[PDB]
Coordinates of C-alpha atoms and ligand atoms in Angstrom, one line a residue:
X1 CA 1.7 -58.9 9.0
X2 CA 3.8 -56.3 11.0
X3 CA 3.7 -53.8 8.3
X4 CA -0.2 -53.5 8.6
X5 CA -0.2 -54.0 12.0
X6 CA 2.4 -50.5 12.5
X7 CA 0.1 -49.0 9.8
X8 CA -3.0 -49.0 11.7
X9 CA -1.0 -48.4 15.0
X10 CA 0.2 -45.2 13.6
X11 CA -3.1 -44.5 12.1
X12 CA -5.3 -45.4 15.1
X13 CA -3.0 -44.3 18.3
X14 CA 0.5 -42.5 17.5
X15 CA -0.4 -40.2 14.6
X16 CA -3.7 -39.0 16.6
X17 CA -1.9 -38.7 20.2
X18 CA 1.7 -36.2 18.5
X19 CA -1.6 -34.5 16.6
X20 CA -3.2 -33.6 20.1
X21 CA 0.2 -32.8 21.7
X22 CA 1.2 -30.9 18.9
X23 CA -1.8 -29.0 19.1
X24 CA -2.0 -28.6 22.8
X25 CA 2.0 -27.4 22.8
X26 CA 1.6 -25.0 20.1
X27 CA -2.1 -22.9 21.9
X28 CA -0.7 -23.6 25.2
X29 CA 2.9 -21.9 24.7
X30 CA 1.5 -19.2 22.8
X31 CA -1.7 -17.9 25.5
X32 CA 1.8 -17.9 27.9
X33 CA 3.8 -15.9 25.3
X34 CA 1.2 -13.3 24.3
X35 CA 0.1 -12.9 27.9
X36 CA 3.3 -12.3 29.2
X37 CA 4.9 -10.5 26.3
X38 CA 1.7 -8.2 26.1
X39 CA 1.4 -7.4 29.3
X40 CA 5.1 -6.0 29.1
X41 CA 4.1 -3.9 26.0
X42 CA 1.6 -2.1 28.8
X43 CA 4.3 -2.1 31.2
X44 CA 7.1 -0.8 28.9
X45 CA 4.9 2.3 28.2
X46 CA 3.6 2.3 31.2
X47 CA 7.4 2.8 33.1
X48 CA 9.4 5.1 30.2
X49 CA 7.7 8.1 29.9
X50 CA 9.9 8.5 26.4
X51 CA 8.0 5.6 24.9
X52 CA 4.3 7.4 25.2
X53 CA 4.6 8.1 21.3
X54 CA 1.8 8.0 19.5
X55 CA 2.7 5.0 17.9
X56 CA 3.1 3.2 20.8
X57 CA 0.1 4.2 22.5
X58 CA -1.7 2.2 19.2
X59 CA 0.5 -0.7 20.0
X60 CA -0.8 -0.8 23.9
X61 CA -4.7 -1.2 22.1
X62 CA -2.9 -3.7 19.7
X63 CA -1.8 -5.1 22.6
X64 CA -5.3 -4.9 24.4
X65 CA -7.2 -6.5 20.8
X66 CA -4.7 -9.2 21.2
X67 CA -4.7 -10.2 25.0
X68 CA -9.0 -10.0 24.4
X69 CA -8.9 -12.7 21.8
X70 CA -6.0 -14.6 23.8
X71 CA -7.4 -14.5 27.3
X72 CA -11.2 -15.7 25.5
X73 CA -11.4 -16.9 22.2
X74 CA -8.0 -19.0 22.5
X75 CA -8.7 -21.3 25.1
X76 CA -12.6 -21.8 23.3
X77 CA -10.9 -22.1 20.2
X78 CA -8.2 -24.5 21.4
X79 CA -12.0 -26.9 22.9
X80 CA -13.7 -26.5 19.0
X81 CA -10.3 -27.8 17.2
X82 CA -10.2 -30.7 19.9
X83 CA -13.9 -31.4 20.4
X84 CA -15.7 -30.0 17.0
X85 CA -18.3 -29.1 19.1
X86 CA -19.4 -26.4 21.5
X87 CA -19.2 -27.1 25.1
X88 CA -19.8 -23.6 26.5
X89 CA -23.4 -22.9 26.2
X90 CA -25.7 -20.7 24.0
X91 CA -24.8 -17.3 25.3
X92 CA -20.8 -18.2 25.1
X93 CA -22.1 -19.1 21.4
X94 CA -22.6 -15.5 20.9
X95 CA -20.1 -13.5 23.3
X96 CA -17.0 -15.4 22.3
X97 CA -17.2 -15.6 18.5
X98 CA -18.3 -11.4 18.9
X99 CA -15.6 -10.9 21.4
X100 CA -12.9 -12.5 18.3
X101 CA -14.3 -10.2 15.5
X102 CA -14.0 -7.1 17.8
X103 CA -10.6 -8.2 18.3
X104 CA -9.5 -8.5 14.8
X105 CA -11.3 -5.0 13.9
X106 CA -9.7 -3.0 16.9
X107 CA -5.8 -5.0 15.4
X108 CA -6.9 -3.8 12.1
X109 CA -8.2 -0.8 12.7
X110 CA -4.9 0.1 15.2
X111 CA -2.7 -1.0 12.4
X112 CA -4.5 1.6 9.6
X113 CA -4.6 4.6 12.1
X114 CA -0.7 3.8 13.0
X115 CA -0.1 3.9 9.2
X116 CA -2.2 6.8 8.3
X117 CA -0.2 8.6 11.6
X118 CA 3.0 7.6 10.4
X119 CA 1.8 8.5 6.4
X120 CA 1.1 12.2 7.9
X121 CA 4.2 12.9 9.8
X122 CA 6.9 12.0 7.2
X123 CA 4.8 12.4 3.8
X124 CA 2.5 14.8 4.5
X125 CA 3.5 17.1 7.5
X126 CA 2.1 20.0 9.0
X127 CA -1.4 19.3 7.6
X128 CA -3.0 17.0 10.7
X129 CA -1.8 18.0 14.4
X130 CA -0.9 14.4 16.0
X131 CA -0.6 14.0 19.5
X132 CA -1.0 11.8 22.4
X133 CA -4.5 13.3 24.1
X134 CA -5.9 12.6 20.4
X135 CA -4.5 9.1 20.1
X136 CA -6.6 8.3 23.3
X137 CA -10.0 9.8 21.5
X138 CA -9.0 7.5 18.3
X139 CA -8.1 4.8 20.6
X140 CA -12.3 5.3 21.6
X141 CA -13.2 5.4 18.7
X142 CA -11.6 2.1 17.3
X143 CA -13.3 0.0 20.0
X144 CA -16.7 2.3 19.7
X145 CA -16.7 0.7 15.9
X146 CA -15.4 -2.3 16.3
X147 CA -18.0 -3.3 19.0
X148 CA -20.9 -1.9 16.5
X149 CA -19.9 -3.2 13.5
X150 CA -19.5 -7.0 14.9
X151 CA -23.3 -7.1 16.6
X152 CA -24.2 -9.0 12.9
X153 CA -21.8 -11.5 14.0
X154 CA -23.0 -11.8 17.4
X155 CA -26.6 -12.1 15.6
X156 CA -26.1 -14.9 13.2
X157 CA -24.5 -17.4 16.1
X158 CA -26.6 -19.9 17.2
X159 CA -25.8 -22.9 19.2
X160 CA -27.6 -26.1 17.7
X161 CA -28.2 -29.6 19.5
X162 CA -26.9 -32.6 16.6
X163 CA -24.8 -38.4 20.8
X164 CA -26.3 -35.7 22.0
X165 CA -23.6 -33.0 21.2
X166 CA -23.7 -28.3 20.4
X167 CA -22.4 -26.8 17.4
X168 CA -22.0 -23.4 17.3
X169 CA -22.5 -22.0 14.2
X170 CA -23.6 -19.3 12.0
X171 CA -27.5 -19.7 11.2
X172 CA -28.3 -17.7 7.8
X173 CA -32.4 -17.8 6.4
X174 CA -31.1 -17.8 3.0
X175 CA -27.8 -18.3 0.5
X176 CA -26.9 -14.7 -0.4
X177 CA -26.7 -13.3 2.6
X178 CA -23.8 -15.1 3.7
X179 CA -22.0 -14.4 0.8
X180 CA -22.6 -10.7 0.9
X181 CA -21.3 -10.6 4.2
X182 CA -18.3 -12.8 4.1
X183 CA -17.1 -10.6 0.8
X184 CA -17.9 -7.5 2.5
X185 CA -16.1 -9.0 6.1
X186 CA -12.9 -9.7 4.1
X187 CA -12.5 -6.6 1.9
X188 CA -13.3 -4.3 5.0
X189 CA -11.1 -6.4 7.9
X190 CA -8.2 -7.8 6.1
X191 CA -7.8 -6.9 1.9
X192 CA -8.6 -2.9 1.8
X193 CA -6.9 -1.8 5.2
X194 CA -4.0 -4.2 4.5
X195 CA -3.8 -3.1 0.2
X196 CA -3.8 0.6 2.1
X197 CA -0.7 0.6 4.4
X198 CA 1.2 -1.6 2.0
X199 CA 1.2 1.4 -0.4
X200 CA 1.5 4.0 2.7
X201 CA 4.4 2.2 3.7
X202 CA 6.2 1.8 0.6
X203 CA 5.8 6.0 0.3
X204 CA 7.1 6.0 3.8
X205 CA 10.1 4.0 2.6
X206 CA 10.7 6.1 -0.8
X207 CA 10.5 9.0 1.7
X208 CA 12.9 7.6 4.6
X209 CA 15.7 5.8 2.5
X210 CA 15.4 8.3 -0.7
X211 CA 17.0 16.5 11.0
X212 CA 18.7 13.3 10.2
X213 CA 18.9 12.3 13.7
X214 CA 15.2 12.3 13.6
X215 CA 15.0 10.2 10.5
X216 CA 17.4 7.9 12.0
X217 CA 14.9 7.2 14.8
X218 CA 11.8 7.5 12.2
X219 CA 13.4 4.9 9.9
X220 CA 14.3 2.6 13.0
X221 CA 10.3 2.8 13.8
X222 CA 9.3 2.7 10.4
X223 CA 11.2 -0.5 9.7
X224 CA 9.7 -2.3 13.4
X225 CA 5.7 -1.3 11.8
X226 CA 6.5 -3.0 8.4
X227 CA 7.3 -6.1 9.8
X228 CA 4.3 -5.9 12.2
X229 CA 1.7 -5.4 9.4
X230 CA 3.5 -8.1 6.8
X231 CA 3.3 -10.6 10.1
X232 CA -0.3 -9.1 10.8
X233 CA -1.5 -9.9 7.1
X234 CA 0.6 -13.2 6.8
X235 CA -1.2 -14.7 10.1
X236 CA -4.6 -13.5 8.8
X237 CA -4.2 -14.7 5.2
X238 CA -5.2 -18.1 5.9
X239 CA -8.4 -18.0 8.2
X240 CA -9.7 -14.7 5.5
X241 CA -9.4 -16.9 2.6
X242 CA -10.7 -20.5 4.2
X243 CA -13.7 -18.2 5.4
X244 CA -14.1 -16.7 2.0
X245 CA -13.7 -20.1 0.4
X246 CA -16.4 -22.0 2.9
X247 CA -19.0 -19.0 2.8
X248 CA -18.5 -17.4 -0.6
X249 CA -17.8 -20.2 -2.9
X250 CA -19.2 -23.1 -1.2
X251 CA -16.2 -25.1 -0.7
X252 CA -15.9 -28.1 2.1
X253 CA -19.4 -29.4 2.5
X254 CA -17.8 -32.8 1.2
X255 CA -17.1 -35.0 4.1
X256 CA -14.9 -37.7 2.3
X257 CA -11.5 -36.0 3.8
X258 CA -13.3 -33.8 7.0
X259 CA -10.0 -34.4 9.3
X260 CA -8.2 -32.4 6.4
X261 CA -10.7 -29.8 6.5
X262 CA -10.1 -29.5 10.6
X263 CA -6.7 -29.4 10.2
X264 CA -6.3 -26.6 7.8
X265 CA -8.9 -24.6 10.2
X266 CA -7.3 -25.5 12.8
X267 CA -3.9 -23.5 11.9
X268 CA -5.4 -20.9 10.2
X269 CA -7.0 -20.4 14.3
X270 CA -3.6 -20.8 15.9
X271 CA -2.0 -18.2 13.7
X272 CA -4.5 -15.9 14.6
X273 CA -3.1 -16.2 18.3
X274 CA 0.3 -16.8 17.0
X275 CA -0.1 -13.2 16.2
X276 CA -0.4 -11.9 19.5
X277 CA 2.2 -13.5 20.7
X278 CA 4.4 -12.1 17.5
X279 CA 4.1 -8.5 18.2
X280 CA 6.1 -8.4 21.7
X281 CA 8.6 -11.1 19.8
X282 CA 8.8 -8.6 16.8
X283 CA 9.5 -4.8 19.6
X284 CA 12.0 -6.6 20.9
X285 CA 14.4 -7.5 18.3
X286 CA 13.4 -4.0 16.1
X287 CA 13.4 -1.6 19.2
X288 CA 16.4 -1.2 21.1
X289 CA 13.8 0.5 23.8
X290 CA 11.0 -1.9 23.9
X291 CA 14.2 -4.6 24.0
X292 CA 15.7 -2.6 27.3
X293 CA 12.2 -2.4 29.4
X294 CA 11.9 -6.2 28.3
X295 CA 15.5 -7.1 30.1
X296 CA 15.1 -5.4 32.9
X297 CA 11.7 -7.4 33.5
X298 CA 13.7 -10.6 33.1
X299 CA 16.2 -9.0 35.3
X300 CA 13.5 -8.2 38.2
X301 CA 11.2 -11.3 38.0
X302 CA 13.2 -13.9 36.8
Ligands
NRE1 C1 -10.1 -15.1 13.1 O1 -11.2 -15.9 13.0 C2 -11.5 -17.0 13.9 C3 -10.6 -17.4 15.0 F1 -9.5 -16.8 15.2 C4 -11.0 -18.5 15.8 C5 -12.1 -19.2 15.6 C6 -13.0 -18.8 14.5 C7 -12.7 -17.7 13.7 C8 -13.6 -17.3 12.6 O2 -13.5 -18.0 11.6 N1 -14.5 -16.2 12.7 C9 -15.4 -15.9 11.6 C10 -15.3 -14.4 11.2 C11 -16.3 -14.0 10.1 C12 -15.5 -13.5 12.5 C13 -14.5 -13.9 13.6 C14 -14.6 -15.4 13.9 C15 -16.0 -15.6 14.7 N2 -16.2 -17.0 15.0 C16 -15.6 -17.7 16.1 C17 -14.6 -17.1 16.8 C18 -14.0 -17.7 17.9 C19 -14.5 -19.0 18.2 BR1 -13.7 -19.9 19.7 C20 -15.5 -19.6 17.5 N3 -16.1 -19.0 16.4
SOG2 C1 -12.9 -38.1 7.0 C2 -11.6 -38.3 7.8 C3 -10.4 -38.8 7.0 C4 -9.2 -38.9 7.8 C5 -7.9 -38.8 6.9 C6 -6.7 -38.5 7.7 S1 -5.9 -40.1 8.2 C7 -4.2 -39.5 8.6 O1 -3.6 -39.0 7.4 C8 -2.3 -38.5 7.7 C9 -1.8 -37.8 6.4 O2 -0.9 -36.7 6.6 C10 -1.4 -39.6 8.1 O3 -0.1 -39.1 8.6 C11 -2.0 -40.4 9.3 O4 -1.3 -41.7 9.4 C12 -3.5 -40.7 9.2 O5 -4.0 -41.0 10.4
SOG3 C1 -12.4 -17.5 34.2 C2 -13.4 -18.5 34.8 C3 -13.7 -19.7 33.9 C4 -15.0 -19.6 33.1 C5 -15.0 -20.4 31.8 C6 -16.3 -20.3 31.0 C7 -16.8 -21.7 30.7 C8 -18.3 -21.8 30.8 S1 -18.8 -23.5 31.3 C9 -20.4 -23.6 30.5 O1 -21.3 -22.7 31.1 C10 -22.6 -22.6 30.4 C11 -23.4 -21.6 31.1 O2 -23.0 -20.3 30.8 C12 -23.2 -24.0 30.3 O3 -24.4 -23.9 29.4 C13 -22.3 -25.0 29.8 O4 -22.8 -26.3 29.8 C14 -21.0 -25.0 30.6 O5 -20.0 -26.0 30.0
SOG4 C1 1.5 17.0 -1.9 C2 1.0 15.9 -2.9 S1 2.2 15.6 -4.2 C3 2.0 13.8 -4.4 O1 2.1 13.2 -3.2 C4 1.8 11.8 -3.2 C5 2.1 11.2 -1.8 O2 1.0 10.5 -1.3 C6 2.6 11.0 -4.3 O3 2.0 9.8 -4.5 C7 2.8 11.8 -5.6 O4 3.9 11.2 -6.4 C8 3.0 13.3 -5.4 O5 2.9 13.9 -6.7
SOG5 C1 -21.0 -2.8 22.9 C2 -22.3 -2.9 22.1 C3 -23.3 -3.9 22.7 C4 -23.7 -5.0 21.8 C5 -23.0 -6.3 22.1 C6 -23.5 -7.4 21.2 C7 -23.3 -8.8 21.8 C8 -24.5 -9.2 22.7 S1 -24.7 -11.0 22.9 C9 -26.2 -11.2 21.8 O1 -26.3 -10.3 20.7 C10 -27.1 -10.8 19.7 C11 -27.1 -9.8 18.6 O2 -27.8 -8.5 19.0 C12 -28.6 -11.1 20.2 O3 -29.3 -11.8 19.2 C13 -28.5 -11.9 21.5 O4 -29.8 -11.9 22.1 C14 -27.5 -11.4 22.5 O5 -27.4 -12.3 23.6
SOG6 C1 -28.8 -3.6 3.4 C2 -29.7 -4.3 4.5 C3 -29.0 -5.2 5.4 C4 -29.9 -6.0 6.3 C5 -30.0 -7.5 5.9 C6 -30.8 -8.3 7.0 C7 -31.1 -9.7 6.5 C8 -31.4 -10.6 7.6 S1 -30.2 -12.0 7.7 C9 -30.7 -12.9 9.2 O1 -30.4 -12.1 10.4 C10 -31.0 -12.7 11.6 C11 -30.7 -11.8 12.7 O2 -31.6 -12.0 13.8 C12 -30.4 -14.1 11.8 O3 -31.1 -14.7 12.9 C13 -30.7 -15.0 10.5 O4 -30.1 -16.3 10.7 C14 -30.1 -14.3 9.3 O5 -30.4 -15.0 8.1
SOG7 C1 -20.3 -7.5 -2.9 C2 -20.8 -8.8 -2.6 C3 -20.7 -9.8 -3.7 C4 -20.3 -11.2 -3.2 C5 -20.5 -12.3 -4.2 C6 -21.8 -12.9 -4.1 C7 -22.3 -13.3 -5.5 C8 -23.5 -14.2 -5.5 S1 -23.5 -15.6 -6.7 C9 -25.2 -16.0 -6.7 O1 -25.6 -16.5 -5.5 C10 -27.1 -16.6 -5.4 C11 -27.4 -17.0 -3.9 O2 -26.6 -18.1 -3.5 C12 -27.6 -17.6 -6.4 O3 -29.0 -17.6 -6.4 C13 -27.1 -17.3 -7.8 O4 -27.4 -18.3 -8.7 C14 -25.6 -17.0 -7.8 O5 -25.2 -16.5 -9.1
SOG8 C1 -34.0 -11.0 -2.9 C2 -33.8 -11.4 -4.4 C3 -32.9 -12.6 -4.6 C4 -32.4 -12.8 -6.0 C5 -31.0 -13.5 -6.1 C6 -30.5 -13.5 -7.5 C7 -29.1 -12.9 -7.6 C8 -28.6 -12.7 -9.0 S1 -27.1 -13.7 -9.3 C9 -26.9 -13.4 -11.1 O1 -28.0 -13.8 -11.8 C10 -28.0 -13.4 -13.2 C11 -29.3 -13.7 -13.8 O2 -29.6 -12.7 -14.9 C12 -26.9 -14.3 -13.9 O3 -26.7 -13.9 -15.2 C13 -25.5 -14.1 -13.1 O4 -24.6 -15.1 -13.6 C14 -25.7 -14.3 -11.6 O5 -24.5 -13.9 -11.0
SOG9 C1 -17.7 -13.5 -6.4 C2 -17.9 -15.0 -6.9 S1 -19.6 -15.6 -6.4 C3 -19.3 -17.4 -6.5 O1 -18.9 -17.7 -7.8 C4 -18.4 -19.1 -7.8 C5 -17.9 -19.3 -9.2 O2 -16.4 -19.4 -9.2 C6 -19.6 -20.1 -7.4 O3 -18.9 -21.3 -7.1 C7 -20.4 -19.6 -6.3 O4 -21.7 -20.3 -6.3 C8 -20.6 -18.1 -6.2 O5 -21.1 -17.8 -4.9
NA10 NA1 -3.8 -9.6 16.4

């Protein structure tokens, strides 16, 4: 019985070893990637002095956000997909899952001031004064939030003994308050910023491709940020709706297919780092400036 004998082969040692080298590949090459590509994004600003828009003074914090959850969270995240358990203590319990919600509220909240900047200048002008010195104060502010807002995270997570083997989990006293909070996490980090600067972008877009020089530059910019929040909310979609679906309507408690359940968690968590690791990707092929300062680095280093 060869068949059989290939069938539980594949099942118990080759399906299970291209699983963990997929997985090992696809965290590993992208913590190199969004380290490297967003430490440029600093150093691109950093060097041209042309480049210290306001816009890409929000995409150095988006940078920052991203390189916080990538230089953390990713490697703890890449132990919990392999493990299913917790292997960094109780106080890690707590730091890194807060330390990934501050992240994705300082993205988030980067990405609505960038839109509400860009929403201002070309829709609405003259109304809000825009400048660098206040980008740094709203800069602040976004982390001032961010790191307030995520203390209920940092509250719930609790690292549990279940062998002899930690989970770190959420611990909730009772069944609404979880649901409460996962609706209200959702609709305030990913659906009503994201629903916001869809529709601030397509007035941007009606306004743009309805003094030319500088729409020619505004349009170039303008197309580069679209791209960034569609990536942004395509890369978040799955994790937001697999948390809303596990803490709002109850769904995988059934352990008949758990390794299914792992897997789709387990992508949704490496497109949230495949994100940081997009942005640089996505100002090099849309700005012919970010695309210079990122071939002269190849040109020094390598
Ligand atoms: C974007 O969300 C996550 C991620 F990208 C990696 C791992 C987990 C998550 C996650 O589902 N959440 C829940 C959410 C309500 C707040 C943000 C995180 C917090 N939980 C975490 C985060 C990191 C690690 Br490692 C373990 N638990
Ligand atoms: C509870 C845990 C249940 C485990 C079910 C996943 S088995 C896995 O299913 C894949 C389907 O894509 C096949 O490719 C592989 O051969 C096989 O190893
Ligand atoms: C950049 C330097 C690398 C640091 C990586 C952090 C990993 C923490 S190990 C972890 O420490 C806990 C105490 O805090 C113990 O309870 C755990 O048993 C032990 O596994
Ligand atoms: C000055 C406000 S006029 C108003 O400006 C909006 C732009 O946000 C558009 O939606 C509407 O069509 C238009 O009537
Ligand atoms: C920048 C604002 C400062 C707040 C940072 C929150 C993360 C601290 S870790 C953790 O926080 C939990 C919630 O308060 C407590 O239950 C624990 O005892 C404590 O170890
Ligand atoms: C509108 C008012 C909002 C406040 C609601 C507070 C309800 C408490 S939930 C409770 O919080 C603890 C924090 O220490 C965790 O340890 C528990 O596991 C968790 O169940
Ligand atoms: C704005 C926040 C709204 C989010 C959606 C949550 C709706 C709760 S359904 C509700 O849950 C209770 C606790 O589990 C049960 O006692 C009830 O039988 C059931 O009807
Ligand atoms: C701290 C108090 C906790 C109470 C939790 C109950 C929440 C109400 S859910 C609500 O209950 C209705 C009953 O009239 C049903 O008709 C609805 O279908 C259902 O959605
Ligand atoms: C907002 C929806 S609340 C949600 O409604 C579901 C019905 O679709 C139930 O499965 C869950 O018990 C309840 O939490
Ligand atoms: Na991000």
């Amino acid at each position: 019985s060869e068949d059989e004998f290939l069938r539980y082969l594949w099942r118990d040692y080759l399906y299970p070893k291209q699983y963990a080298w997929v997985l090992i590949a696809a965290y590993v090459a992208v913590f190199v990637v969004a380290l490297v590509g967003n430490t440029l994004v600093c150093l691109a600003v950093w060097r041209n002095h042309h480049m210290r828009t306001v816009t890409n003074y929000f995409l150095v914090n988006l940078s920052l956000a991203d390189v916080l959850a990538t230089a953390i969270c990713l490697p703890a995240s890449l132990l919990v997909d392999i493990t299913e358990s917790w292997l960094f203590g109780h106080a890690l319990c707590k730091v890194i899952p807060y330390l990934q919600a501050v992240s994705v509220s300082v993205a988030v909240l980067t990405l609505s001031f960038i839109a509400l900047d860009r929403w201002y200048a070309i829709c609405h002008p003259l109304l809000f004064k825009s400048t660098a010195r206040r980008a740094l104060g709203s800069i602040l502010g976004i982390w001032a939030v961010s790191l307030a807002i995520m203390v209920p995270q940092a509250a719930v997570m609790e690292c549990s003994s279940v062998r002899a083997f930690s989970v770190c989990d959420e611990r909730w006293a009772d069944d609404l308050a979880p649901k409460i909070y996962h609706s209200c996490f959702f609709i305030v980090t990913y659906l009503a910023p994201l629903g916001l600067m869809a529709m601030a972008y397509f007035q941007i877009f009606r306004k743009l491709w309805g003094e030319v020089k500088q729409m020619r530059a505004r349009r170039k910019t303008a197309k580069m940020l679209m791209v960034v929040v569609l990536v942004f909310a395509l890369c978040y979609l799955p994790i937001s709706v697999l948390n809303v679906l596990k803490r709002v309507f109850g769904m995988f408690r059934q352990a008949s297919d758990r390794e299914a359940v792992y897997a789709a968690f387990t992508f949704s968590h490496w497109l949230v780092y495949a994100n940081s690791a997009a942005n640089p990707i996505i100002y090099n092929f849309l700005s012919g400036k970010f695309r210079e300062q990122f071939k002269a680095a190849f040109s020094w280093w390598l």
